[PDB]
């Protein structure tokens, strides 16, 4: 893998970043987030997922702010945020900070979301739970349903039981997996050392700072295996999109992906979806974020109209 050579002249640094971003306190702990200001009748929430932070949409969403405005946490315990005040980093920790922190943001009564890997997660289950505040759904390598089979999923199936094992502890407290191997694995340039510095920092160090890294991926909502809480998350907001006929939603494949493939039928059972591709693995905005940006904002303004 190859550096872009035109990427060093717009490199955002972490600090450059965290500089542009400001914080919220939030119950007992606080986000730091990214917020364009301006166009402040619609709101375009953006989510990170797994190893990452605000941070990955840091070219992307220079194109969707001049038509709305535009806000980026760091989720409870990742990026710049605090950390959760009983060191619990589940699907539902992660709920109830950012829908404590949602109320402090004076949104719009519809909001537009853009999610990604489990922020599609919680920006589906925040859908599910207030049906009426929602203008459209943007999602990419998403949790789109439970799993019933790893017959189209890349070859994880291990790793994820190893995972949930106590060698989970291991694989992320000790050894940062999600961000030292899975992260520059499944981006297809390499990230530029400061790039990856950023990703780094929030769990440079070693142990229990980790932990949000290796919660994430046992929340896997295996209908075998699966905690049982998260499958009926996903089963109850997966029932709810399908059933979304005048819900306007954009799925952006990723090309050859990392679980795209194993979820696309999956996003076809969501009515209402406008389908668009970029070539990528998993992270895919460290490949693609210009042409990423430019198909959301495309979709934003048909929607806004």
Wanted: with cysteine; aromatic share 12%; proline share 6%.
């Amino acid at each position: 893998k190859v550096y872009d050579p035109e990427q060093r002249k717009r490199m955002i640094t972490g600090p450059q970043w965290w500089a542009r971003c400001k914080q919220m306190n939030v119950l007992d702990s606080f986000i730091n987030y990214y917020d364009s200001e301006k166009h402040a009748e619609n709101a375009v929430i953006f989510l990170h997922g797994n190893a990452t932070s605000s941070y990955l949409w840091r070219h992307v969403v220079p194109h969707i702010e001049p038509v709305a405005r535009c806000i980026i946490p760091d989720l409870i315990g990742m990026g710049k945020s605090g950390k959760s005040g009983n060191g619990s980093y589940r699907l539902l920790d992660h709920y109830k900070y950012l829908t404590a922190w949602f109320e402090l943001l004076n949104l719009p009564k519809k909001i537009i979301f853009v999610g990604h890997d489990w922020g599609a997660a919680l920006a589906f289950h925040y859908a599910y739970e207030h049906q009426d505040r929602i203008k459209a759904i943007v999602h990419m390598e998403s949790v789109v349903d439970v799993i019933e089979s790893w017959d189209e999923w890349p070859d994880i199936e291990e790793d994820i039981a190893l995972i949930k094992s106590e060698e989970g502890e291991k694989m992320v407290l000790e050894n940062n997996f999600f961000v030292e191997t899975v992260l520059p694995s499944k981006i297809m340039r390499k990230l530029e050392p400061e790039e990856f510095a950023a990703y780094l920092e929030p769990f440079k160090e070693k142990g229990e700072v980790r932990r949000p890294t290796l919660s994430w991926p046992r929340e896997i909502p295996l209908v075998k295996g699966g905690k049982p809480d998260v499958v009926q998350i996903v089963r109850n907001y997966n029932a709810y999109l399908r059933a979304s006929d005048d819900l306007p939603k954009l799925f952006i494949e990723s090309d050859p992906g990392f679980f795209s493939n194993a979820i696309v039928e999956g996003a076809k059972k969501f009515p209402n979806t406008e389908f668009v591709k970029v070539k990528g693995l998993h992270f895919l905005q460290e490949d693609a974020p210009d042409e990423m940006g430019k198909y959301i904002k495309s979709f934003v303004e048909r929607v806004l109209k």
